[PDB]
Design a protein around this ligand. Structure first.
Ligand SMILES: C[C@@H](OCc1ccc(CN)cc1)c1cccc2c(-c3ccc(CS(C)(=O)=O)c(Cl)c3)c(C(=O)O)[nH]c12
Ligand SMILES: [Zn+2]
Ligand SMILES: [Zn+2]
Length: 232
């Protein structure tokens, strides 16, 4: 009823949308992994009379439910999707998207990692993102590679029309007490990658983490703090 949704509002298999700004929504879904339930976020950005999707809803059935929720709430076709790293909360559901007419994209690094790990593989490679600090335009967003953080391939997304920074899993919510699932992370480089984000997007008004509640720019410093303390 208006607050940002959590798993207590989200049974696994259902998807909620949250209006972030004009033409910008997040999507929220829940999934089970290793016997615990987690929320995760993605982004939807209006692209004229089409929509750009950032990240799947963490699984095939969740992603089908996402498409249905978008049709119900927005009613514009999703034509393209970008996955911001290779984990299942970002690419699980790419096969559903591809069978629903959505062109799927990721960096070559993400595509290689997804293939090697047995995850679903976006169709199209996003060049121009292989060096930290690189940025490219993709419809109504800018894609930015900050360096290794949560994963070596993690991308962040900026919506310039709304000053919305979608950090993905390189950015944690303010309530977080540890750095999440760090299996594929680089804890030593992560603060430097966050500093790159802070320098590149000083005018961000909303910052959206890969999991949990949006806030402001403080999410970036908080992330650096929790990662430095985790490394210790
Ligand atoms: C999809 C998968 O990604 C990793 C993965 C690890 C190993 C393997 C098998 N090699 C596959 C995938 C995944 C699976 C399960 C959980 C996560 C989390 C996660 C996010 C937040 C918190 C709360 S907090 C900041 O700690 O307060 C916690 Cl506990 C965990 C994150 C995240 O941090 O982005 N990702 C998760
Ligand atoms: Zn991840
Ligand atoms: Zn994640």
């Amino acid at each position: 009823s208006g607050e940002y949704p959590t798993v207590n509002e989200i049974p696994v298999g259902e998807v909620r949308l949250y209006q972030i700004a004009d033409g910008v929504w997040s999507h929220i879904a829940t999934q089970s992994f290793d016997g615990a339930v987690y929320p995760s976020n993605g982004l939807i950005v209006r692209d004229g009379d089409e929509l750009l999707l950032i990240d799947t809803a963490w699984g095939a059935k969740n992603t089908a439910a996402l498409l249905a929720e978008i049709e119900k709430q927005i009613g514009l076709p999703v034509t393209r999707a970008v996955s911001t790293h290779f984990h299942d909360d970002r690419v699980g559901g790419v096969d559903v998207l591809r069978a629903a007419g959505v062109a799927t994209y990721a960096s070559p690094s993400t595509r290689r990692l997804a293939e090697a790990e047995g995850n679903e593989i976006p169709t199209h490679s996003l060049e121009g993102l292989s060096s930290s600090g690189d940025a490219v335009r993709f419809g109504p967003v800018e894609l930015f590679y900050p360096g290794a953080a949560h994963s070596t391939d993690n991308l962040v997304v900026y919506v310039p029309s709304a000053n919305v920074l979608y950090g993905g899993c390189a950015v944690h919510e303010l309530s977080s007490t540890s750095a999440g699932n760090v299996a594929d992370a680089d804890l030593a480089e992560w603060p430097t990658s966050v500093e790159r984000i802070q320098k590149h997007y000083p005018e961000a008004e909303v910052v959206i983490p890969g999991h949990g509640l949006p806030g402001g720019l403080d999410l970036l410093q908080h992330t650096a703090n929790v990662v430095k303390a985790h490394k210790n």
